[PDB]
Paper text:
In the best-characterized E3-E3 pathways, ARIH-family RING-between-RING (RBR) E3s ligate ubiquitin to substrates of neddylated cullin-RING E3s.
The two ARIH2 molecules in the asymmetric unit superimpose with 0.6 Å root mean square deviation (r.m.s.d.), hence only one is described. The canonical RBR E3 catalytic elements (RING1, RTI helix, in-between RING (IBR) and Rcat domains) are interspersed with the ARIH-specific UBA-like (UBAL) and Ariadne domains in a two-part arrangement. The ARIH2 UBAL, RING1, RTI helix and IBR domains form an E2~UB-binding platform. ARIH2’s UBAL domain stabilizes the E2~UB-binding platform on the opposite side, by intercalating between the RING1 and IBR domains, and packing against the RTI helix.Fig. 1 a, ARIH2 schematic color-coded by domains. The Ariadne domain is an elongated four-helix bundle. A groove between the first and third helices of the Ariadne domain secures the catalytic cysteine loop from the Rcat domain. The second crucial portion of ARIH2 is its N-terminal region, which is not present in the crystal structure.
Numbering used by the authors: 58 to 127, 134 to 493
Write the structure that this text describes.
Amino acid sequence: EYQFTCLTYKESEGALNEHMTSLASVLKVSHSVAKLILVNFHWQVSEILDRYKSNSAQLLVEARVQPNPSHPPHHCAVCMQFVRKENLLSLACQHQFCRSCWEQHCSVLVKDGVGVGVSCMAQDCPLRTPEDFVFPLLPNEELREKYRRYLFRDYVESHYQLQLCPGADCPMVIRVQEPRARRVQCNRCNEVFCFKCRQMYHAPTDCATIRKWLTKCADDSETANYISAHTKDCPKCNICIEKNGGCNHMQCSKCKHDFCWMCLGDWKTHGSEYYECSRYKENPDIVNQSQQAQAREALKKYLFYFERWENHNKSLQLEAQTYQRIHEKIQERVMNNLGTWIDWQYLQNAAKLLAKCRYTLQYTYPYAYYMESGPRKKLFEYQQAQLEAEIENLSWKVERADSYDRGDLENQMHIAEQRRRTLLKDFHDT
Ligand SMILES: [Zn+2]
Ligand SMILES: [Zn+2]
Ligand SMILES: [Zn+2]
Ligand SMILES: [Zn+2]
Ligand SMILES: [Zn+2]
Ligand SMILES: [Zn+2]
């Protein structure tokens, strides 16, 4: 699995303070300056030391500590009033302003949730106020504690090895030794998410691609109001069949016809060998046609992928309900002394494996939509077809568990898991 850790806010504070003190000792700088450097360089100590040896002036400028190199005032530039010399503060940029206006500036910014990003009051000036400068300018303790909380938030966000738990009101931090776009789960609120973008787990797609896909699903006119079909007419009977299970292999109870929920085409074409339902039938010479036909083809392709994305989500939901009913039936058998949980554990294992596999499959479709043509896309489409075929086989067998024995169900489990593993090892990239 992915090697991650769940730390409390106290442990995270301790780790961050250790890093700060080490860097402040090494660089012969104050703690606030060291924090500024660490935040600007995402707490990557190696790059910080390398660039400090390369150009210390450029490092202090980029970290917003010193102004770019390329007699008092007694007049604050924002309140226009004359003030005392001691009540006239400034950063290294020497932009001087009076103490009352500094207090007002910091108080407003902190009240608006700003932590690290408090900057000089002069336009364009990139300098950022260090902690030891802001803290005396905050009068009350709730303001100082708000500032500390926002600073800790910004520190965990900027730290390349740490991420705040997206769970609502969850005071946990997820730590990772080598940050990648992989699945993590907080052990206090059970929130699952991708480590890189802090959104829903989305393998094999990367973070940018899935963000684009979600925005397109929500914004495009043809999909913003989309509702998946609850019922469909049997290709043989025309009877209104309802989709209650997650398995897309439907058998009409009236005529015994086996068809596919996405196609309305017969199921004997949807075996593991020669699985075609998941590939988009692309047009090769449609780049050489009119803009009308090109836009129509773009709509066709987008809908082909989006409908399967949506239907696999719906199937995940329906299969979760099926798993709940299975759990209830095993509970009933156990209390009736018809067996024990160990003898039906294979069924719940199959259900969890099916959920995992169909999650992966659901996310394979944005990946296939945003892929460019070529042999890599053909390889991905073959692996995706194998995954989908074995997934629908496993879901059929899980929905009808009393008609199948332990052996073939575990075999289908292993087959679907192997297909999912192959897809992930080939296409879950950096
Ligand atoms: Zn002023
Ligand atoms: Zn300034
Ligand atoms: Zn959590
Ligand atoms: Zn991500
Ligand atoms: Zn029928
Ligand atoms: Zn199909």
